[PDB]
């Protein structure tokens, strides 16, 4: 059984590299962030451009949706995050306190907290309502490439160029687990599986790994793509077949069977590094986005 993703829409309008695309939890929208300092909102099913959200002074590296699809948070080279009301497009809060580029961000499922990672090597936990920084975790010894809450918000997973993935207790800020690899390649991406029991970690040696973190054991390895230079978003695809989806520095989207680790599809058409992929919450739809030579978002649709 293999998916049959086919190109449906190419979304143009960003004027520099796209950095991140995310589907809204309610499935209605795709949000894209860009080095061009802008957030754009697109219709998930018809690809229709909806609006541009602006205000960051420098380029954006990540954007994330609140669980009710009403808010966005963005992470910028200007050292801030911004919380945006999607309906109005207005900046509700500017989150200040990182001392270098903010690289990655996410809401917790309750969506009263934001977690951020920065080139300043810290992970910060913020109050959505007030914008207060509640905790600063000295998480890593090099830039922090990804931050993600587990299903109930009780854990945070972070990854860094220092070669580590760390699991943190949200309430206390204490590190509960550090996964290490003897070769210590930079960890460029990490995220919890939908059920929260596993983590998917990218390393800059062209490798994705599925870890059981309750046991600290690597259960699967996915290869064949190119990933040596960029922090490329990867995903669990669960609406149809159980896949792993990732961008790649050879301009393709890679899709693997999660259990067998075989590549089941490669999506061709981008003209630069596919820096970001996202999977729709209910339909077999992938959004992909690429760097400076391309600047576009593509929407792909599969029967399974």
């Amino acid at each position: 059984v293999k998916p049959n993703y086919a190109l449906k829409f190419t979304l143009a309008g960003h004027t520099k590299a796209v950095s991140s695309v995310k589907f809204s939890p309610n499935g209605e929208w795709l949000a894209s962030s860009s080095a061009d300092k802008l957030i754009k909102i697109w219709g998930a099913y018809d690809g229709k451009f909806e609006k541009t959200i602006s205000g960051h002074k420098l380029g954006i590296s990540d954007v994330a949706w609140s669980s009710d699809s009403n808010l966005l948070v963005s992470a910028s080279d200007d050292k801030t995050l911004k919380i945006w009301d999607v309906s109005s497009g207005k900046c509700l809060k500017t989150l200040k306190g990182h001392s270098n580029y903010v690289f990655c961000c996410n809401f917790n499922p309750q969506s009263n907290l934001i977690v951020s990672g920065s080139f300043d090597e810290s992970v910060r936990i913020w109050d959505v309502k007030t914008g207060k920084c509640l905790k600063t975790l000295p998480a890593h010894s090099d830039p922090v490439s990804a931050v993600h809450f587990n299903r109930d918000g009780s854990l945070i997973v972070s990854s860094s160029f220092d070669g580590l993935c760390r699991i943190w207790d949200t309430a206390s800020g204490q590190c509960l687990k550090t996964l290490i690899d003897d070769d210590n390649p930079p960890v460029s991406f990490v995220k919890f599986s939908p059920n929260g029991k596993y983590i998917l970690a990218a390393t800059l040696d062209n490798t994705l790994k599925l870890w059981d973190y309750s046991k600290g054991k690597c259960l699967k390895t996915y290869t064949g793509h190119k990933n040596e230079k960029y922090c490329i978003f990867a995903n669990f695809s669960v609406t149809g077949g159980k896949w792993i989806v990732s961008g790649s520095e050879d301009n393709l989207v890679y899709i693997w069977n999660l259990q067998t680790k075989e590549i089941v599809q490669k999506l061709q058409g981008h003209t630069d590094v596919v820096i970001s992929t996202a999977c729709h919450p209910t339909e077999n739809i992938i959004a992909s986005a690429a760097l400076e030579n391309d600047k576009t978002i593509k929407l792909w649709k599969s029967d399974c």
Binding site: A35, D62, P143
Partner: peptide
Amino acid sequence: GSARARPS
């Protein structure tokens, strides 16, 4: 640019 769009 943005940090995510720059190679390491």
